Amino acid sequence: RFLKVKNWETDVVLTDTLHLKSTLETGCTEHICMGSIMLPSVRTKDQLFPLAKEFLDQYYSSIKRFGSKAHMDRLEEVNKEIESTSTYQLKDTELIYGAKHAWRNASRCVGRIQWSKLQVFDARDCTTAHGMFNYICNHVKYATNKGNLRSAITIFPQRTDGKHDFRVWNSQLIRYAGYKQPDGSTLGDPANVQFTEICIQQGWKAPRGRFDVLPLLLQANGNDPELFQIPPELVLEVPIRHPKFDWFKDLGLKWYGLPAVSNMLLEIGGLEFSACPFSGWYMGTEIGVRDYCDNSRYNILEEVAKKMDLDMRKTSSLWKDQALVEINIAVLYSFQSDKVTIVDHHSATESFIKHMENEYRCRGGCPADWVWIVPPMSGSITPVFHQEMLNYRLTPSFEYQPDPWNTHVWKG
Amino acid sequence: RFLKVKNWETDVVLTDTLHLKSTLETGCTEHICMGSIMLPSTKDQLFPLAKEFLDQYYSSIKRFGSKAHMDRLEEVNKEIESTSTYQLKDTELIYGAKHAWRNASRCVGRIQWSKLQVFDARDCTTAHGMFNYICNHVKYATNKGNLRSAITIFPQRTDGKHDFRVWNSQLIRYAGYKQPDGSTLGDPANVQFTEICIQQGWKAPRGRFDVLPLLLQANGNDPELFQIPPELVLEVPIRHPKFDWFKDLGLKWYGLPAVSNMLLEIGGLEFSACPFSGWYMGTEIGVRDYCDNSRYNILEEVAKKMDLDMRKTSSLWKDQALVEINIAVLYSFQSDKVTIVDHHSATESFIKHMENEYRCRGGCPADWVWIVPPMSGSITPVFHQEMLNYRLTPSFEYQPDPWNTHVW
Ligand code: HEM
Ligand code: HEM
Ligand SMILES: Cc1cc(N)nc(CCCCCc2cc(C)cc(N)n2)c1
Ligand SMILES: Cc1cc(N)nc(CCCCCc2cc(C)cc(N)n2)c1
Ligand SMILES: Cc1cc(N)nc(CCCCCc2cc(C)cc(N)n2)c1
Ligand SMILES: Cc1cc(N)nc(CCCCCc2cc(C)cc(N)n2)c1
Ligand SMILES: C[C@H](O)[C@H](O)[C@H]1CNc2nc(N)[nH]c(=O)c2N1
Ligand SMILES: C[C@H](O)[C@H](O)[C@H]1CNc2nc(N)[nH]c(=O)c2N1
Ligand SMILES: [Cl-]
Ligand SMILES: [Cl-]
Ligand SMILES: [Cl-]
Ligand SMILES: [Cl-]
Ligand SMILES: [Zn+2]
Ligand SMILES: [Zn+2]
Ligand SMILES: [Zn+2]
Numbered sequence: 001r002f003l004k005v006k007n008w009e010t011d012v013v014l015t016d017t018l019h020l021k022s023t024l025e026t027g028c029t030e031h032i033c034m035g036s037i038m039l040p041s042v043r044t045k046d047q048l049f050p051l052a053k054e055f056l057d058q059y060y061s062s063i064k065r066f067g068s069k070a071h072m073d074r075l076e077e078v079n080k081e082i083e084s085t086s087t088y089q090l091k092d093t094e095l096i097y098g099a100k101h102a103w104r105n106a107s108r109c110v111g112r113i114q115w116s117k118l119q120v121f122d123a124r125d126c127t128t129a130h131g132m133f134n135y136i137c138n139h140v141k142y143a144t145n146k147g148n149l150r151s152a153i154t155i156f157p158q159r160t161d162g163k164h165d166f167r168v169w170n171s172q173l174i175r176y177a178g179y180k181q182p183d184g185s186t187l188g189d190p191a192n193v194q195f196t197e198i199c200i201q202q203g204w205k206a207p208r209g210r211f212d213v214l215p216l217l218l219q220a221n222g223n224d225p226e227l228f229q230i231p232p233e234l235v236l237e238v239p240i241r242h243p244k245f246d247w248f249k250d251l252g253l254k255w256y257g258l259p260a261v262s263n264m265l266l267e268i269g270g271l272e273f274s275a276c277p278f279s280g281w282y283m284g285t286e287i288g289v290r291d292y293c294d295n296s297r298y299n300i301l302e303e304v305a306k307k308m309d310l311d312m313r314k315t316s317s318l319w320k321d322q323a324l325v326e327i328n329i330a331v332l333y334s335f336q337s338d339k340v341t342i343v344d345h346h347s348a349t350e351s352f353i354k355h356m357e358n359e360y361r362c363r364g365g366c367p368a369d370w371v372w373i374v375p376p377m378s379g380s381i382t383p384v385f386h387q388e389m390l391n392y393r394l395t396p397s398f399e400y401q402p403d404p405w406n407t408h409v410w411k412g
Numbered sequence: 413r414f415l416k417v418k419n420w421e422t423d424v425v426l427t428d429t430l431h432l433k434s435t436l437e438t439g440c441t442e443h444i445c446m447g448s449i450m451l452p453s454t455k456d457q458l459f460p461l462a463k464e465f466l467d468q469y470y471s472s473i474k475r476f477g478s479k480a481h482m483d484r485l486e487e488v489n490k491e492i493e494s495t496s497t498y499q500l501k502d503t504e505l506i507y508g509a510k511h512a513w514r515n516a517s518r519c520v521g522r523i524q525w526s527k528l529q530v531f532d533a534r535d536c537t538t539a540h541g542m543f544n545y546i547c548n549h550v551k552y553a554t555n556k557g558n559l560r561s562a563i564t565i566f567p568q569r570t571d572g573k574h575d576f577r578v579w580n581s582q583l584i585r586y587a588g589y590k591q592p593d594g595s596t597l598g599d600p601a602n603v604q605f606t607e608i609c610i611q612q613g614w615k616a617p618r619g620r621f622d623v624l625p626l627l628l629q630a631n632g633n634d635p636e637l638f639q640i641p642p643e644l645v646l647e648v649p650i651r652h653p654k655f656d657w658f659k660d661l662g663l664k665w666y667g668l669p670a671v672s673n674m675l676l677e678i679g680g681l682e683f684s685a686c687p688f689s690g691w692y693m694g695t696e697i698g699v700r701d702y703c704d705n706s707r708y709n710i711l712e713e714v715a716k717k718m719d720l721d722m723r724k725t726s727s728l729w730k731d732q733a734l735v736e737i738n739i740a741v742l743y744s745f746q747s748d749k750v751t752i753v754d755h756h757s758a759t760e761s762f763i764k765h766m767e768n769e770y771r772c773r774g775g776c777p778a779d780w781v782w783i784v785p786p787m788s789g790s791i792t793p794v795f796h797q798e799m800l801n802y803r804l805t806p807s808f809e810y811q812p813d814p815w816n817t818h819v820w
Contacts, residue, residue, distance in 0.1 A: 003444070003453070004453075005449070006450070008450065008706075009704065009705050009706050010706075019443065019444050022443045022444060023443075025442050025443075026440065026441070026442060026443065026444060026445040027445075028438065028440035028441065028442065028444075028445045028447075029438070029440065029441070029442060030437045030438055030439075030440065030441060031431065031434045031435075031437075031438065031802055031803075032415070032431055032434065032438060032440075032800055032801070032802045033438045033439075033440045033445065033446075033447050033779075033800070033801040033802070034440075034445075034800065035440070035445050035447025035448070035780065035781070035801065036447070036780035036781075036797075036798055036799045036800075036801075037417070037798050037800070038418070038420065038798065041415065041416075284726075289790050289791070290790060293790070293791055294421065294790065294796075295421050296420075296421050296422075301791065315754050315756035315757050316694075316742045316746065316754040316756075316757070317739065318735055318738055318739050318742070318754070320756065320788065320791050321735045321738070321787065321788045321791070322735055322739075324788060324791055325728055325731045325732055325735055328728055328731070329727070329728050332726045332728070336726065344725050344726040344728070346725035346726075346730060347725050347726070369445075370447065370448035370781055371447070371448075371780055371781065374789070375789075376789050376790030376795065377731065377787065377788050377789065377790065377791075378730065378731045378734055378787055378788070379784070379785075379786050379787065379789050380699050380700065380703070380704065380786035380787065381699070381703055381711065381730050381731070381734055381787075385786065386704075387448075388448050388449050388450065389448045390444055390445070390446065390448075390449075391444070391445040391447065391448075392443055392444045392445065
């Protein structure tokens with residue numbers, strides 16, 4: 001099977017063969033496309049060895065040692081380990097290759113040109129929540145690099161029986177608290193209200209401001225999670241100002257420099273890494289469009305357009321669009337002036353298309369989820385909008401997992 | 413089989429049961445999603461398709477299983493057995509046309525679906541007759557700027573040798589010409605079609621906004637050329653409410669969007685010439701027509717005139733210029749009293765429509781990749797709305813351009 005994608009701006013046609021290695025499910029059928037649905041709609045030995053073998057065959061192919069003595073010995077070694085212990089341990093080299101590939105395969109990620117430059121911190125020797133905290137502080141400090149951001153992932157011990165899971169309960173390492181007020185308003189980030197309530201319940205003394213960095217809630221080996229405050233000196237933040245509008249700074253906005261997803265599961269060779277926080281750097285629109293301008297987030301559009309004195313009587317003046325652009329200008333300018341790494345959506349999508357073409361040429365394809373790849377403003381003036389994409393699942397992979405407060409068996 | 417969609421901005425969850433009535437193919441499989449791929453990657457079959465449609469028709473008028481329902485099914489079976497096809501009643505034709513729009517998963521404007529004026533042109537026999545039908549459609553739909561939705565339906569496919577086709581992709585579009593320079597004058601989307609028109613004898617004005625002639629095929633005959641009366645083509649010069657220099661770009665656009673190359677399938681019958689029209693959403697002109705690189709591509713010129721810093725993408729000069737172009741489009745149409753809708757207002761109405769459809773029909777097939785506007789996506793309410801895309805009949809479908817099919 002050869003599948004073709006077309007770019008409607010350039011007429012460039014690419015051929016995908018890589019989808020032949022695809023697995024599991026998109027959620028779609030011939031009757032229904034689930035392409036805009038956000039989420040999907042204790043492993044046993046017999047399913048495990050095949051998954052292991054397929055990963056190790058990929059790994060050995062990549063190092064040009066396929067079918068070598070080392071390859072065959074490693075398959076043997078893993079087979080026996082699975083028979084005797086019901087699981088197996090990855091070599092450090094396989095772990096690194098796996099984590100890099102999970103990012104390479106991440107179909108919703110526009111930043112994948114960067115995939116081969118990922119710093120992998122092996123935290124599989126970690127045993128306690130205090131140990132997790134120390135690993136996470138080191139990750140934050142290394143990745144932040146005083147504003148010169150470096151991609152990184154920290155990998156805690158894999159799942160065993162599903163009763164001893166390592167989990168970071170935070171959805172990201174750094175996020176701001178949100179507090180629901182008795183009057184139904186929200187102080188801080190509305191996205192984080194439920195998690196904030198949990199932290200408070202667990203004993204966090206909330207400052208109750210608009211930009212309070214949440215504590216880490218960390219679970220090791222299936223134990224009840226424990227609270228830790230990231231040292232404030234490790235959390236780099238950027239005050240948001242605008243290059244022409246001197247009132248913009250008095251909106252009192254700021255954001256943190258380090259985007260670091262901590263609630264996803266990393267699958268490599270059938271093993272499940274339930275705590276694997278990873279971080280990169282922001283594309284400006286994640287802050288300027290989503291974080292600031294979503295109605296269910298900080299929701300600043302009206303306030304900004306008021307200060308710009310836009311005609312807000314009718315949507316057809318495009319006041320929302322005008323304010324949206326100025327806010328995004330402000331984020332890019334603020335990060336750049338403070339020398340904190342950031343990429344604009346024109347640059348990131350241009351780089352993504354170059355990456356994608358390269359992957360089709362060298363790898364036979366690049367699974368990509370258009371719904372997520374196309375930026376949330378100015379979509380069609382970016383080169384990804386007119387690019388046909390094919391979405392499919394390759395492993396190693398990152399996956400969603402249930403929020404741990406829903407499934408954790410409390411010890412007491 | 414029993415599906416939920418969530419709106420991530422409002423937490424509203426809706427249940428889709430309508431997808432149980434879905435058909436043909438999406439192009440997707442369990443291994444691979446083709447959501448962002450633009451195109452699809454006899455007597456025996458006809459009666460089931462007719463029955464399926466007539467059952468839905470009789471249900472819709474609260475007469476399912478009635479003698480009249482059974483007699484009609486009977487009548488149609490007889491007709492197919494004897495003539496190899498059948499003819500739709502006028503009521504069935506109107507219902508099918510309206511539902512083909514209701515089912516159009518890529519259309520954000522479907523709140524309007526029941527207010528569609530259907531012009532029955534099944535008695536048309538010649539290209540000259542087609543031309544008269546289309547002028548009337550144009551004049552009716554335009555209505556001096558107070559635009560009204562309409563479709564004109566020419567005779568159905570028979571043996572596929574006698575197709576009615578409008579060769580134009582829209583009833584009104586601008587010519588495109590490749591220049592000795594190597595650049596393109598006019599609309600680059602229309603270069604190939606313009607060439608065909610020239611080959612067929614059209615005397616080309618060779619300007620930037622030349623309204624293309626119609627190329628009309630009746631009864632599978634060779635297509636013939638007609639000029640739409642200039643006075644029936646309403647156009648709007650584009651100016652900006654604040655930038656005085658904007659009008660000096662010399663931009664204009666036509667008021668009537670009218671798709672003419674699709675195929676209407678109703679109860680297994682295929683209407684290959686079925687031009688349909690509505691009114692524009694502003695971004696269709698301001699973002700796609702003006703700002704696509706392969707279209708009029710004016711972003712750089714507008715940015716220059718605004719004196720923005722064009723040295724680095726991160727100044728967002730492209731985004732600023734995009735917004736201003738789109739303000740101008742809306743302002744110009746509004747000032748000339750030509751119906752237009754902005755993307756905020758259109759997407760808000762679609763969400764209202766979609767909730768109605770879930771409530772009253774059990775769903776609303778929608779293609780997110782097409783429904784989300786091409787600028788400011790996430791500040792419109794459709795961005796956060798999960799959608800399910802599936803194919804219901806009656807339907808509009810792509811068909812091959814006829815210059816690849818037609819034997820002269
Ligand atoms: C290096 C700079 C990076 C940039 C500019 C970038 C950009 C982005 C953006 C804009 C999104 C969509 C976010 C949203 O829609 O809210 C995303 C998603 C994602 N990225 Fe990246 N990314 C980067 C690095 C990374 C790294 C280091 C990894 C993992 C090792 C990663 C894996 C992912 C995954 C798994 C998703 C999907 C998340 C989900 O489904 O919720 N990215 N990326
Ligand atoms: C009356 C106001 C209407 C509005 C504002 C509107 C809006 C739109 C828009 C914005 C698109 C996508 C255009 C693009 O991406 O270039 C679209 C697609 C479409 N619409 Fe509408 N529409 C309207 C009326 C109609 C009518 C009257 C019909 C048929 C009777 C129709 C059927 C379709 C179909 C079949 C598509 C997809 C065409 C394709 O796949 O190329 N719409 N609509
Ligand atoms: C809180 C949260 C968790 C999660 N799994 N997914 C989301 C939506 C996608 C977030 C991805 C953010 C991101 C992550 C990285 C690594 C870089 C970058 N520029 N941006 C949010
Ligand atoms: C296109 C696509 C890519 C991808 N990485 N993931 C998906 C969703 C697959 C959902 C089921 C797989 C799964 C789910 C969970 C919870 C764990 C695990 N190891 N695997 C789709
Ligand atoms: C030239 C052309 C033909 C075609 N089938 N499809 C396209 C892309 C979609 C065009 C639909 C434009 C439209 C059509 C209608 C009826 C109303 C409205 N506001 N906009 C372009
Ligand atoms: C989701 C979806 C909706 C829709 N209306 N159409 C499709 C494409 C399915 C292929 C349609 C097959 C077909 C093709 C032709 C040429 C005519 C005709 N009556 N039917 C997908
Ligand atoms: C590849 C991509 O699907 C293609 O360019 C689509 C994307 N979304 C679109 N959406 C609309 N409304 N109109 C279009 O023409 C397109 N083009
Ligand atoms: C329903 C819809 O798919 C959902 O809101 C998605 C749409 N596309 C997105 N794209 C990105 N990059 N991030 C998102 O959070 C979303 N949300
Ligand atoms: Cl968003
Ligand atoms: Cl979002
Ligand atoms: Cl476009
Ligand atoms: Cl387009
Ligand atoms: Zn959002
Ligand atoms: Zn799909
Ligand atoms: Zn376009």
